[PDB]
Amino acid sequence: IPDPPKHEHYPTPSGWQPPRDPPPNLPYFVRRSRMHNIPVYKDITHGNRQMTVIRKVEGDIWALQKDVEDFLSPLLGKTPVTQVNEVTGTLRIKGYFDQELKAWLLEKGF
Amino acid sequence: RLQYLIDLGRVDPSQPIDLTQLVNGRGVTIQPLKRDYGVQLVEEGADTF
Amino acid sequence: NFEKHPKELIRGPIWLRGWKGNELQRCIRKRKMVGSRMFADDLHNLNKRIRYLYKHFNRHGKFR
Amino acid sequence: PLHKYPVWLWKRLQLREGICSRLPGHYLRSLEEERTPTPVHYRPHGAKFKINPKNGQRERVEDVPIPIYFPPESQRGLWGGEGWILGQIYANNDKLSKRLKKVWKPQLFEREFYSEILDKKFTVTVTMRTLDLIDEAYGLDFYILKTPKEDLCSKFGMDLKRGMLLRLARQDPQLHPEDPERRAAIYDKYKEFAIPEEEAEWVGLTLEEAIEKQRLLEEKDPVPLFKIYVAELIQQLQQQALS
Amino acid sequence: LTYFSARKGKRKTVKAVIDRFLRLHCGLWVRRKAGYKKKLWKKTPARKKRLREFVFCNKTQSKLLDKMTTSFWKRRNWYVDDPYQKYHDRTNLKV
Amino acid sequence: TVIVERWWKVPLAGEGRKPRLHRRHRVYKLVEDTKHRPKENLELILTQSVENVGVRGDLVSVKKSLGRNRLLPQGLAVYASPENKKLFEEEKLLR
RNA sequence: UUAAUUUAUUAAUGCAAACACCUGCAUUAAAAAUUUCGGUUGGGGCGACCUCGGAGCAGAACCCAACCUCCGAGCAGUACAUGCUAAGACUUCACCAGUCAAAGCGAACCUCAAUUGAUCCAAUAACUUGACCAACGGAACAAGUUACCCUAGGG
RNA sequence: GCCUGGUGAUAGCUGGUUGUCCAAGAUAGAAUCUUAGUUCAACUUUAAAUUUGCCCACAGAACCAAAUCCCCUU
RNA sequence: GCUAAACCUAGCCCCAAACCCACUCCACCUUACUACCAAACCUUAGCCAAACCAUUUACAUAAAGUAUAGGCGAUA
Ligand SMILES: [Mg+2]
Ligand SMILES: [Mg+2]
Ligand SMILES: [Mg+2]
Ligand SMILES: [Mg+2]
Ligand SMILES: [Mg+2]
Ligand SMILES: [Mg+2]
Ligand SMILES: [Mg+2]
Ligand SMILES: [Mg+2]
Ligand SMILES: [Mg+2]
Ligand SMILES: [Mg+2]
Ligand SMILES: [Mg+2]
Numbered sequence: 001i002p003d004p005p006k007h008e009h010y011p012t013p014s015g016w017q018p019p020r021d022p023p024p025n026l027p028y029f030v031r032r033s034r035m036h037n038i039p040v041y042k043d044i045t046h047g048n049r050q051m052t053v054i055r056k057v058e059g060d061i062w063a064l065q066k067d068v069e070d071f072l073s074p075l076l077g078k079t080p081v082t083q084v085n086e087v088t089g090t091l092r093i094k095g096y097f098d099q100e101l102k103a104w105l106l107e108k109g110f
Numbered sequence: 111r112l113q114y115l116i117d118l119g120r121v122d123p124s125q126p127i128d129l130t131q132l133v134n135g136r137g138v139t140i141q142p143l144k145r146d147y148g149v150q151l152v153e154e155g156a157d158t159f
Numbered sequence: 160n161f162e163k164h165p166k167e168l169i170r171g172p173i174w175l176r177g178w179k180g181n182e183l184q185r186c187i188r189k190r191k192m193v194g195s196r197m198f199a200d201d202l203h204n205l206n207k208r209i210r211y212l213y214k215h216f217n218r219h220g221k222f223r
Numbered sequence: 224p225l226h227k228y229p230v231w232l233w234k235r236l237q238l239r240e241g242i243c244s245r246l247p248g249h250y251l252r253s254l255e256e257e258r259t260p261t262p263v264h265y266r267p268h269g270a271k272f273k274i275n276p277k278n279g280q281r282e283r284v285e286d287v288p289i290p291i292y293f294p295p296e297s298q299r300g301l302w303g304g305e306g307w308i309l310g311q312i313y314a315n316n317d318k319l320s321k322r323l324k325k326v327w328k329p330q331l332f333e334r335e336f337y338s339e340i341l342d343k344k345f346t347v348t349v350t351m352r353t354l355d356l357i358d359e360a361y362g363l364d365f366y367i368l369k370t371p372k373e374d375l376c377s378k379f380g381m382d383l384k385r386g387m388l389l390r391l392a393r394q395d396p397q398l399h400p401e402d403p404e405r406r407a408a409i410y411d412k413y414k415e416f417a418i419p420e421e422e423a424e425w426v427g428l429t430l431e432e433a434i435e436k437q438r439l440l441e442e443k444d445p446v447p448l449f450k451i452y453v454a455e456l457i458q459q460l461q462q463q464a465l466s
Numbered sequence: 467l468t469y470f471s472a473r474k475g476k477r478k479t480v481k482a483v484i485d486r487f488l489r490l491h492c493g494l495w496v497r498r499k500a501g502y503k504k505k506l507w508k509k510t511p512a513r514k515k516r517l518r519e520f521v522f523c524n525k526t527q528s529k530l531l532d533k534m535t536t537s538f539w540k541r542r543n544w545y546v547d548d549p550y551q552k553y554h555d556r557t558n559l560k561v
Numbered sequence: 562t563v564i565v566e567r568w569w570k571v572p573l574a575g576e577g578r579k580p581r582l583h584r585r586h587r588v589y590k591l592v593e594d595t596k597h598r599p600k601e602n603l604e605l606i607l608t609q610s611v612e613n614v615g616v617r618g619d620l621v622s623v624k625k626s627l628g629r630n631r632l633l634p635q636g637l638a639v640y641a642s643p644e645n646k647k648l649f650e651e652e653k654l655l656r
Numbered sequence: 657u658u659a660a661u662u663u664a665u666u667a668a669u670g671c672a673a674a675c676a677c678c679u680g681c682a683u684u685a686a687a688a689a690u691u692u693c694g695g696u697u698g699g700g701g702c703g704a705c706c707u708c709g710g711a712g713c714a715g716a717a718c719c720c721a722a723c724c725u726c727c728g729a730g731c732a733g734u735a736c737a738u739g740c741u742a743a744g745a746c747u748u749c750a751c752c753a754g755u756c757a758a759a760g761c762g763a764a765c766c767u768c769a770a771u772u773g774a775u776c777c778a779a780u781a782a783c784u785u786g787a788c789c790a791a792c793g794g795a796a797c798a799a800g801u802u803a804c805c806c807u808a809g810g811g
Numbered sequence: 812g813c814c815u816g817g818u819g820a821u822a823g824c825u826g827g828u829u830g831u832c833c834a835a836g837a838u839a840g841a842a843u844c845u846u847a848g849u850u851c852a853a854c855u856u857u858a859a860a861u862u863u864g865c866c867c868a869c870a871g872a873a874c875c876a877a878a879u880c881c882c883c884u885u
Numbered sequence: 886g887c888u889a890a891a892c893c894u895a896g897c898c899c900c901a902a903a904c905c906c907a908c909u910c911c912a913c914c915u916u917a918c919u920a921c922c923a924a925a926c927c928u929u930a931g932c933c934a935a936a937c938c939a940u941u942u943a944c945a946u947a948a949a950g951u952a953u954a955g956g957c958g959a960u961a
Contacts, residue, residue: 002119012117013158036118048561048860143948146544172900178945184475192945195229206944209472211819213943216470218934223533227904236904264564266592282952287571287580289589292927305562309928310589314662318568319796319940319956321690322588323664324928327563330596330679337634351596351673352562354629358603361640412644468960471950472943478950482958486775500752500774506784508772511738513754524751526851536950561860563680570954572961583961585941587928594680596673626675661939691939694844717872717880719839749840750852776957793842796956797939809824810847820932844937 024109031056298378300348381427392423495523565589604641
């Protein structure tokens, strides 16, 4: 799959935007996908479990769980109920917050 | 979708975009069995194109 | 460089190299792949097994 | 276990093993062939493709032939490409009635013919379709020399064919003795079907009858080893004579 | 139904089901009402208006119809000028 | 001859295969019997002064019974082939 | 067997084919052949019944049985906007069917309780129409009997 | 008749279904050649999502007894 | 402490590969195993399923359980 071409200004008309150089000095890091998109996926199960997955998380997932939990709790009032999977390196939040986490992770520089 | 493919280098707009170029960029999966007769353009995303 | 699949590494009956099925499917596949040169009463036993296993999977059980 | 070869090849293998493999190639070709007969008991379709009315899409059509049964009297006489039709009917042409079985027999006629090549009147049981094909061929000699073995489908018609073809293959003076002009006129009328004599003997032989003919060709009294040893020893004394 | 065919060893669809029902991609089966073209002379126009409707199916009717067809019938279909195409995706459910 | 037609249609076989039949493909329907058709005349050239049907050299169309029973055995007529119509055009050119 | 379905089999006719037999197509007989003989039931049988509605049982939201007690129904009449659409509801304890309906467009300026029948198939250019399918959720069409009965079971 | 085969015939019927330990768990019905059975429902079970459930007070529910429905508080 | 108990290895199964066999002498289709005299082919049917049964009911991959057929139902 090709490297995306260098554009003049960002974001691109589709809203794509490359990861920034240098990588930010957070404790954690999130990769991109094959397709250079930031990896926050929605996920339904049982027909009513709406949830969202941050997936290629490399580093300290517990800092990422603290920062996500600090980011979403004004949008909910309560702390969001999450689950880190330290093995695979995912983080799983309950309820759809895909657009907010994609925008948020673009702000963070990943 | 097509602006998205052009931005990420997957479809080169400085050449003609036939159906082979949308398949090789893997922008559109079309299957001739199951009687797809090809692509239809769709007006979604006309503003911001 | 993808010049062979791993399923071309397995040796066995010709009707189940790189193929997995339940028993009715193993019998159907064996009959259509090798059944023409099967022995007479083996072919006959196998026809009766497909006929039995047909009548079992399709008409008997708990879940439907 | 399994056989090495499928069972429907077994017959074919027997045509390579023993007595069958020494048969002439033009005979074994005439057994291996599988061309279809002319439809007699069913309308053929027109073409390969056909637009059906129900969905208006062109769909390919084959025409599956009806199985014909030939009682052995059909091989004693000349029927057409035809025989009995052993089948079933629904009782009053609706599928919701009794399926009950039917045999369709053709209409037979003892007629009589005159083969000009063999020069003989035969009394043959024949059908109306055979008489029609004789008329379309312009004579029983042409009807027999033109029709394919498969299509003709009589052992007797094939024996007539071997008779006529050996008569043409030899240019026989026994057709009309003491009338050579009539012989040359008859032989030039059917000049189209000239076959060599080495091929015209094997025409219309069944496989068992060809096995017999080939068995009588290559049967010999064995050579007494006296003569073989004399040949070898006079060979050796003629090698010593030239030393 | 036939769970394993004798030729392929696959499931088969019941073709009565296809002949009477319409599977929308979200999982809803649409049907026609029974008797919508019978004895119209003795039905009130309210009732005739009720019978000429495309009526959705039950949950268990829906699962019974899913089990009686195969995955070919459960598939996205991008037809040209499809009348039912705006009814495939399910808008604005809150479960 | 008796032409039949199968009731139950045969699934088509392909190009290098034979159609494998079932016991329901043995159920035929009588589409035609050829003997009950309008009967045709055949063309013969008479080669004698035969009765009122014609004179010498003249090609006519006879009932099949008279043609096959009385004319063609007895050498009264020859078939209307493209071989002997030549010979009898050339016989008519020598009068 | 005068139950239902056949006439493949014979035997006759009749018509075609052919120049009486044979073949083809009808038709009538005999000989048979295939298949069947619903349910309720103070054990079973006779009688009676099998679907829909009203009342009592079931006194006051809903529901509630019986070979329980009493009435009924299987239409008729009027109108021809008894047009078309459409929020929201009820519902015979499922489903299927049933009911009610504002707003709207178009116009004027239905009564009765029940008053009924699915799917497939037919008929029709179309709109529509089609069962005492009353065994009334209806198998497209199948009777009596066996102390000769038989088998699997139950009392 | 008997034998072999189809044949592992079919059986809504009878009989039988093999380690351990814990947990949750019983009585409306409708159709059906149906009442020795099935299908749907009701009840039951697990998993999931959410927000109310149960008990109930005044008021309220028709003309021709015991109670119930409804129902905020608690 | 009797009766007993134990035991591995005859062979076999499933594949693969490969196309098998068959006159020491004598006797052997008559009452086979006896030395020797005047004619073959002709639709499988049904079980079963359809909860009866009556038409019907299966006998490489992928297209595809698609087109089709079907008491338009079981099913194919
Ligand atoms: Mg998912
Ligand atoms: Mg209800
Ligand atoms: Mg009934
Ligand atoms: Mg009923
Ligand atoms: Mg059993
Ligand atoms: Mg049963
Ligand atoms: Mg407990
Ligand atoms: Mg019934
Ligand atoms: Mg029962
Ligand atoms: Mg409340
Ligand atoms: Mg049955």
